Every structure is written in structure tokens, then in C-alpha cells.
């Protein structure tokens, strides 16, 4: 007789409304780990994040978008707000494991770059300083309608993937606190990306 050979897999285009990745922020603790499910209609975010279907998928070039709640017994999203330059949000899906990093929140030039230098390369502080991602901000409110925030290359024209382009990870919630009038977005910028098969999960779960 025969048997399957058992790998990491995974569909190369989720399956809508069902969960495909799990993500992890150590900052927030250990106990802080929600599933990722495909798609953002209601019924989507009410166990956790959900991916905007149109946006790319972790670990790829352009950016991967999701959103989620901010209140409630378990709200994915309340704290946002608390997350510094360089803390890390950790993806994983079927398949892989990817880092990324909270990207400069508010400030500019000089202060941009040491705060970047922190924790991307050289040439990823220099893009986020004087280049391509030189105007996207880690943190900051906005309207509902402000479609861009998820665009391959964030609060830009530029909607496909590009081979020149960073991953680009963006968390969308309700804003203010008890209110849905406004959206906070977070951008942080892929460091690390990895196929799983291996006990290997990445040294950022251990920070915090
Ligand atoms: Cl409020």
C-alpha cells in the first residue's frame, strides 16, 4: 500500500472567508495571535483580521492589506496606536514565515533615517528617507474612503505590483476609539521571508 507525502501547502489563492495565515505581534505579548481570514465583508472580521482580496498576499512585493476591529471582548486592533518604529508584526501562512516592521511614525529627514536604520538595511532607509517610500507614514488617521492606503505602493497611484517595489504589510481599524467615522492605518515594511519545512520560526517571536 501507499500513503500521501505530507508538506507544507497551500491554494495560491485563498479561499474566501476562510482563514489562510495567522499573525502575531510580541510587543503585545505572547497570548496575541490572531488567524487572518480572506476578505473584509462583516462577517469576515468578527473572529479576527481579514485580508482585502484585492491586495497582496504576505511576503509579496506591493502590499498586503488588512483590516480589523478595535472594540470588543477581543478586537484584534485596539492598540495600534502603542505599536513603535521597528516592532515587529510576524505572518504566518501554510507555507512561510515572514517579518515585518513598523515603518517611521511622524518623523522626517534625519530623525526618519536613525529611526530606520534600526531595523531595515541601509538601502531600505535610504527608500524610506529620500525615495519611493519617502511620503508613507507608519502611522496616521484618515477617512473611510481613503482607498490608496491599500495600494501596491501605499497612498499612490501606482495599484499593480512592481518587481522595484518593498513588501509593504498595512493594518486598517475604526477611529476614534469608540467611533467609526475615522480609519488608523499602520504601514510596516518586510525585513524577513521564508519558506516554512523546518523548526525554524523567526527570532522575532521572541522579542517584547
Ligand atoms: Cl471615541
Known sequence: QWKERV?????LTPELGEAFARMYIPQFGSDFQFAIVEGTTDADLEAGPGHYNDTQLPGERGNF????HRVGKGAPFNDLGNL???????????????????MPVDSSGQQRYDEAMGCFTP???????????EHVNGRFITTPGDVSTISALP????????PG??????????????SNAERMIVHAMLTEHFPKNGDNKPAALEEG
Open 155 to 162: 497612498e499612490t497611484d501606482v495599484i499593480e505590483a512592481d
Open 123 to 133: 538601502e531600505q532607509a535610504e527608500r524610506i528617507t529620500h525615495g519611493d517610500y
Open 65 to 68: 492589506a488588512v483590516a480589523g
Open 165 to 178: 517595489m518593498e513588501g509593504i504589510m498595512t493594518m486598517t481599524t475604526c477611529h476614534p476609539q469608540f
Open 84 to 102: 513603535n518604529v521597528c516592532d515587529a508584526i510576524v505572518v504566518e501562512t501554510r507555507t512561510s514565515w515572514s517579518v515585518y516592521r513598523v
Open 7 to 11: 508538506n507544507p501547502r497551500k491554494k
